[PDB]
Amino acid sequence: RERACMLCGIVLPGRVFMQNGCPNCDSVLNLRDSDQATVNECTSSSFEGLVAVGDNEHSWVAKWLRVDRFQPGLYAVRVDGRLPSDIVAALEQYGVYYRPRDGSVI
Amino acid sequence: SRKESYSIYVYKVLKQVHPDTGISSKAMGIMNSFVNDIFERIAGEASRLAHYNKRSTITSREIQTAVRLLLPGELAKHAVSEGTKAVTCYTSA
Amino acid sequence: VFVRPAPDSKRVTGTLFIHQNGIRYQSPVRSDHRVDILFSNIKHLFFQPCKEELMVIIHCHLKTPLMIGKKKTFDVQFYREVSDDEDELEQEQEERRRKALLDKEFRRFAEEISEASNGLLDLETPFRELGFTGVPFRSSVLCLPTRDCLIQLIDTPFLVVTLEEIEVAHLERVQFGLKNFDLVFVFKDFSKPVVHINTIPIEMLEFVKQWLTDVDIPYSEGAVNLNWGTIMKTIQADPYEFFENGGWSXXXXXXXXXXXXXXXXXXXXXXXX
Amino acid sequence: AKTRSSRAGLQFPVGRVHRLLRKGNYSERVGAGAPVYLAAVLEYLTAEILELAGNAARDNKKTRIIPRHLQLAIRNDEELNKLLGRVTIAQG
Amino acid sequence: KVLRDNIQGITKPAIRRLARRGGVKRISGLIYEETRGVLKVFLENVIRDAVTYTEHAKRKTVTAMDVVYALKRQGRTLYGFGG
Amino acid sequence: NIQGITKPAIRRLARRGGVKRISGLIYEETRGVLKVFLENVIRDAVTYTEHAKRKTVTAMDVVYALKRQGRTLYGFGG
Amino acid sequence: TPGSFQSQHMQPGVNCSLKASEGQIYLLDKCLFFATKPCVYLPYSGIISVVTSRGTGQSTSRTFDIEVQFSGGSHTFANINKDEQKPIEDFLKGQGVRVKNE
Amino acid sequence: PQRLLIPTVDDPGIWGVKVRLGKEKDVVRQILKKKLAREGTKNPLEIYSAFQRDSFKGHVYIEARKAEAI
Amino acid sequence: ELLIRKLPFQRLVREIAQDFKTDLRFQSAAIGALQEASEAYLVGLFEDTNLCAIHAKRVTIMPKDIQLARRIRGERA
Amino acid sequence: LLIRKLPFQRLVREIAQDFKTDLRFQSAAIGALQEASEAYLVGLFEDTNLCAIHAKRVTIMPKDIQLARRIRGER
Ligand SMILES: [Zn+2]
């Protein structure tokens, strides 16, 4: 069982997301301090295009996927599902813009 | 010295309320204990509020809000009304 | 309609029919599981709508006991059950519609039973606002007053106390700051066993005393659970000698009879120093 | 009106309550109407209790109030018993 | 003189009476000992505090106010004996 | 806003309390009990706030209101 | 006879409930014995691990539960006083039984 | 932005290697595990990223700068 | 971790508070403390209820069990 | 008071004999102790009766006392 975090794009097991949260998005999402509904709304088990990154700084792939400022690990090219309107508004309150990874937005 | 108690005041209040009723000595002991207990509760809570708010004076507001905390609804309302009335008339006089 | 007590170990729905001199319950699965109840044998006819209940009830309390299957019973109950954020609030509104539908139909049927009796049977309904909680048997239940009876019909075994058959009520365990009390009904027929209602909350004491007075039932209060197995057998042995020596009127002893008090302090309502 | 009780129309002693509030180590300073307010509250509460105690003693055909009647008054009043739920009354 | 095993001075009728005042109709036979133990643990908890007050006042007699303070500390305020 | 305490939440609270089977009226009973508790605590807190002449309810008011009830709470500045 | 186990109250056993049945658990030198219908005998050689739950999360549970796991199933003893937790754990560790604390 | 991120000549190269069917994600996870394990050592795995696509079956793409790293 | 969702509890708190004084503000820590206290209280109550239910030789907790526990605690009269 | 005044006095002295040897008592100390003890026991019997009625019984048993003391928070 593995899920792909919608915001940062990292892929981790769903139980890891529930118990410890997203190591990168915890500053703005509080996934560890969030219930199962919010975890499902921000981490999706349906994804495609597994990506393993070793060096975020110099990898052009990481810059192209906007994951060069995040923790190395499993990443997904495309994630099924989008963030809810309330979570998007909450992120806009923090000043961070959310760019969907669903592929439908380009 | 001559021990202090609220016995004469309870007689006064009783005659004000029930002119044709009397109180036993033990019931007066209970009433004195009750009055002392309530005074202790209210003064302790007033001190707690004053310390909570970094104040060094007990004013009628602290006593009023202590009564608001301690007494239940109707009791608090009537006792607050009585106290404000008495304080207003003492100030006026 | 479901019947209690059931004529078979299997719970089966049936049809209730009104006839010229009584009612007939008839199961669709077996013709032999008919229950016939004559109007002449019904003592009390109760209806109870779903005011808080998952069920609607038509209860027949009988003068003479009937043999339903293997059980002798004074009580025959006919019943049906309703049981099966805005969406959950709307599902409660749909349950409230289903309650009102079954309530209207079963009330109408119980009135039609009363009409078919040619005025032999009055339709009684429980006054829910006058209800109090207590333990007549093994569970805490809401006891409901009616016009002529004190009832509990939701759980088996059923309680049906006719108010006119009561000789005296005794309130046991009533004393200084007590948590709960018991209520005992003694009947005019001393051969009938006394009925206990236990753990009535002490908050309901003054209400129960008022209600007993409004119904013309004498009451007495006691700190101790008096034994009635002893009291009744002595009263059955010689009822005349019992009343000769004061019956229950002397036992009541309402007069406080307290003058000793606890003395008094020097009565002085004067400011000292 | 010499006594402060008279100036406030009270029966309890304003001066004694003032002395106890001062010589009691509660706060550095004390107001002028806090003793008055507290005495008024105390007198009101005692009157409240004595009314029901008189009622209970009159329901038992008794002229003197005893601990029994105080117990009855307290345990029969919803608000007083809530106030005094953790209080034991001797001979009650 | 030392006192030895005076707990049995809480005879069966005292406990039965106390139960009747409490509203109890039928009393199991194991109750009386149960109650006795409970009472012991209560008194030992109250007395240990009363004695603590008495010893702190550098006195040798246990006064009523010591008991009153010990009870007040447990939320057992008692009216009638002072306070 | 009292329907926001859903049935699964009460089930979760009972499971952390070790409860194995739950009736159907437990949910309404629990909602009533919680409402009474919250009513008392918030009333005390608002009393503290009004006395402090504030329009915002602080964490200190809640902590003192719980200390008033006897429900001392650690970890919020007490 | 009763073993070297002594409760906080200096008692040879502890009050507990097994399901709906209230009773007494005795920690004997070779076995755990529950003396109340149904009677349960558990030899220490057959016990895999003992799991103690003191609240399984927030809120202090005044009474804790002991789950004894063995090769044929588990037995949950409930409603044990929390003061008895340390004496029971130290005794079971002394008998070589694996104690786990959630 | 998104348009500015298009690759240049100086960006690290990408090599694709054929693997057995159904093992592409396994190779990706093994490469990530080796990269994490050899990080901080005297001879770390000098790669930058690696991935695969479900549609492009049998292909594993690694972004690096040297064939010896591959 | 807290078993109640945050927004429903905040809405409930504001609904209740609005009956004593309009335009009241709550620090987020006040709501957090209230939620911690309420859940701790409810868990203790459920433990007592479970004890009562097991005492009656049952497994299912019932409203009468809750009422009995609250009465024995001294919360309901 | 239902308990007498002299067996209770002896019990109180016996219990007090552990904390300090040869301690005197005062006019209203033993009386207050007896009042508090009887009030406490009556409340405990009220709770025990409630539990026994809850169990569909009329007889109070030691496990009802234990449950009452557990819920009260007594050790
Ligand atoms: Zn993330």
Q: What are the structural domains of chain E?
A: 4-83 (1.10.20.10)
The position carrying tokens 């049977």 is C121
Measured between alpha carbons, how far is G86 from C137 in angstroms, rounded to an integer?
A: 43
**Contact in structure between E54 and J23 (CB atoms under 8 Å):** yes
**Contact in structure between G80 and G64 (CB atoms under 8 Å):** yes
Which residue ranges make up each domain of chain A? 2-103
The position carrying tokens 């007889």 is J59
Number of structural domains in chain D: 1
Q: What is the CATH number of domain A2-103?
A: 3.30.40.210
Distance (Å) from CA A42 to ligand 1 centroid: 8
Q: How far is CA G98 from CA G3, G26, G77, G94, H42, in A?
A: 19, 18, 17, 10, 43
Two tokens at I63?
């409203």
What dihedral angle (degrees, nearest 10) is formed by the CA atoms of G65, G68, G69, G74? -70
Two tokens at F63?
């902590």
Count the residues in chain I.
77
Question: Within a 10 A sphere around the Cβ of C46, how many other Cβ atoms?
Answer: 23
What dihedral angle (degrees, nearest 10) is formed by the CA atoms of F14, F19, F20, F24? -60
- Residues E76, D88: C-beta atoms closer than 8 Å: yes
Two tokens at C42?
């019904």
Q: How far is CA F17 from CA B49, C84, F5, G85, in A?
A: 36, 29, 17, 18
Could you give the strand order of the β-sheet that contains G31-34, starting from the edge strand earlier in sequence? Answer: G40-43, G31-34, G21-28, G14-18, G73-81, G63-70, G47-53, G99-101
Q: What angle (nearest 5°) sits at the alpha carbon of residue G84, between those of residues G80 and G88?
A: 100
**Contact in structure between G25 and G77 (CB atoms under 8 Å):** yes
Question: Within a 10 A sphere around the Cβ of J41, how many other Cβ atoms?
Answer: 24
Measured between alpha carbons, how far is J43 from C178 in angstroms, rounded to an integer?
A: 8
Measured between alpha carbons, how far is E50 from D86 in angstroms, rounded to an integer?
A: 19
**Contact in structure between C76 and C37 (CB atoms under 8 Å):** yes
CA-derived radius of gyration, chain E: 16
- Whether residue C267 lies within 8 A of chain B, CB to CB, comes out as yes
Which helix (H) or strand (E) segment holds residue J43: the answer is helix J29-54
Residues linked to residue G66 through DSSP beta bridges, in sequence order = G52, G77
**Contact in structure between A101 and A9 (CB atoms under 8 Å):** yes
The position carrying tokens 């998005």 is A25
Buried b (16+ CB within 10 A) or exposed e, A4-34: bbbbbbbbbebebbbeebbbbbeebbebbeb
Neighbouring chains to C with at least 3 Cβ pairs closer than 8 Å = B, D, E, F, I, J
Measured between alpha carbons, how far is J68 from J71 in angstroms, rounded to an integer?
A: 5
D46 to chain C, closest Cα gap in Å: 15
| Contact residues, chain I, for C140 at CB < 8 Å | 64
Domain range holding D26?
Answer: 3-92
- Residues I14, F26: C-beta atoms closer than 8 Å: no
**Contact in structure between G58 and I40 (CB atoms under 8 Å):** yes
- Residues C263, B11: C-beta atoms closer than 8 Å: no
DSSP letter string, D34-62:
HHHHHHHHHHHHHHHHHHHHHHHHHHTT-
| Contact residues, chain G, for J66 at CB < 8 Å | 15
Q: How far is CA C51 from CA C57, C88, C100, C129, I24, in A?
A: 12, 19, 9, 11, 38
Q: Choosing among C140, C141, C206, which should be mutated to test the I contact, i.e. which has the most I CBs within 10 A?
A: C140
Two tokens at A9?
């794009």
- Which CATH number do you get for residue D46? 1.10.20.10
Burial class (CB in 10 A: 0-12, 13-18, 19+), I50: buried
Taking alpha carbons only, the member of A83, A80, A59, A81 closest to residue A69 is A59
Alpha carbons within 13 A on the beta-carbon side of C139: 14
**Contact in structure between I61 and F23 (CB atoms under 8 Å):** yes
Measured between alpha carbons, how far is C215 from C219 in angstroms, rounded to an integer?
A: 11
Q: How far is CA H1 from CA A65, A66, B22, in A?
A: 11, 10, 93
Query: Any alpha helices (H) in C117-151, and if so which ranges?
Result: none
Two tokens at H69?
């790293």
Burial class (CB in 10 A: 0-12, 13-18, 19+), C6: middle
**Contact in structure between G98 and G46 (CB atoms under 8 Å):** no
Count the residues in chain J.
75
For chain J, after which residues does the C atom lie more than 2.5 Å from the next written residue's N, i.e. where is it broken?
none
Residues 6+ apart with CB under 8 A from A88: A98
Q: Is A42 annotated among the ligand-binding residues?
A: no
Measured between alpha carbons, how far is A36 from A44 in angstroms, rounded to an integer?
A: 12
- Residues E23, C176: C-beta atoms closer than 8 Å: no
Q: How far is CA A4 from CA A12, A96, B21, E22, H63, in A?
A: 6, 20, 83, 65, 22
Distance (Å) from CA C74 to ligand 1 centroid: 71
Number of structural domains in chain H: 1
Taking alpha carbons only, the member of G16, C115, E6 closest to residue J66 is G16
Buried b (16+ CB within 10 A) or exposed e, D68-92: bbbbbbbbebeebeebbeebbbbbb
Q: Choosing among G7, G8, G15, G60, which should be mutated to test the J contact, i.e. which has the most J CBs within 10 A?
A: G15
Q: How far is CA J69 from CA A79, E16, I39, J41, in A?
A: 57, 19, 24, 11
**Contact in structure between C121 and C42 (CB atoms under 8 Å):** yes
- Classify residue C74 as left (phi > 0), alpha (psi -120 to 50) or beta: alpha
Measured between alpha carbons, how far is J69 from C55 in angstroms, rounded to an integer?
A: 39
| Contact residues, chain I, for D85 at CB < 8 Å | 74
Burial class (CB in 10 A: 0-12, 13-18, 19+), C183: buried
Measured between alpha carbons, how far is A31 from A87 in angstroms, rounded to an integer?
A: 12
Measured between alpha carbons, how far is C160 from I2 in angstroms, rounded to an integer?
A: 49
Two tokens at J42?
């009556």
Crossing angle, helix J62-72 and helix E31-56, to 10 degrees? 40
Helix (H, G, I), strand (E, B) or coil at C6: coil
How far, rounded to the nearest angstrom, does the alpha carbon of residue B71 sit from its chain's CA centroid?
11
Domain range holding H7?
Answer: 1-70
Q: How far is CA C49 from CA A105, C57, C141, C250, in A?
A: 59, 7, 17, 43
* Phi, psi dihedrals of residue B12, rounded to the nearest 5°: -60, -50
- Residues I29, F59: C-beta atoms closer than 8 Å: yes
CA end-to-end distance (rounded Å), chain B: 34
Helix (H, G, I), strand (E, B) or coil at B83: helix
Residues linked to residue C134 through DSSP beta bridges, in sequence order = C141
Resolution for this experimental structure (Å):
3.6
Domain range holding B22?
Answer: 3-93
| Contact residues, chain G, for F18 at CB < 8 Å | 53, 56, 61, 65, 78
Q: Are there at least 3 beta-carbon pairs closer than 8 Å between I and E? A: no
Residues linked to residue G34 through DSSP beta bridges, in sequence order = G25, G40
Q: Which chain C residue's Cα is nearest to I65?
A: C140
Helix (H, G, I), strand (E, B) or coil at G85: helix
Number of structural domains in chain B: 1
Helix (H, G, I), strand (E, B) or coil at C199: strand
- Residues C262, D66: C-beta atoms closer than 8 Å: yes
Measured between alpha carbons, how far is H1 from G32 in angstroms, rounded to an integer?
A: 70
Question: Within a 10 A sphere around the Cβ of C39, how many other Cβ atoms?
Answer: 20
What dihedral angle (degrees, nearest 10) is formed by the CA atoms of J18, J24, J29, J35? 50
Which helix (H) or strand (E) segment holds residue C80: the answer is strand C71-81
CA end-to-end distance (rounded Å), chain D: 40
The position carrying tokens 């902590």 is F63
